[PDB]
Amino acid sequence: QRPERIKTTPYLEGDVLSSDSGPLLSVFALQEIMQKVRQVQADYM
Amino acid sequence: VYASELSVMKVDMRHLSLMQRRFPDVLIQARPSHFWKAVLNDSPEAVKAV
Numbered sequence: 291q292r293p294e295r296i297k298t299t300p301y302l303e304g305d306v307l308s309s310d311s312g313p314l315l316s317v318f319a320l321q322e323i324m325q326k327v328r329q330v331q332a333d334y335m
Numbered sequence: 336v337y338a339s340e341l342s343v344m345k346v347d348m349r350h351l352s353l354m355q356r357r358f359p360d361v362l363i364q365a366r367p368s369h370f371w372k373a374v375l376n377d378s379p380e381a382v383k384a385v
Contacts, residue, residue: 293366298375 340382347374 297303351370355362375383 293364293368296368296372298368298371 337382337385340379344374344378344382347377 348370351374352367354370355365
């Protein structure tokens with residue numbers, strides 16, 4: 291529909307590997323921040 | 336055969352590329368990808384496969 295997501299030549303035709311979304315990375319970003327702090331504080335005094 | 340099917344594809348695009356300047360009120364968002372996709376649909380499959 292949009293004139294930039296239309297492909298004519300088969301150069302940009304690849305296999306779909308995985309799909310990430312909006313509210314799936316935002317909870318993922320909050321996990322990997324506190325996971326770093328709860329790992330650093332549990333190794334040193 | 337294959338050299339005479341490219342010649343039909345060029346004459347179809349030599350005359351379709353003026354349809355926007357002639358009719359601006361119908362094609363306001365027709366970028367030149369749009370008449371590339373239209374001629375390739377009406378073309379033989381064994382020419383685009385080459």
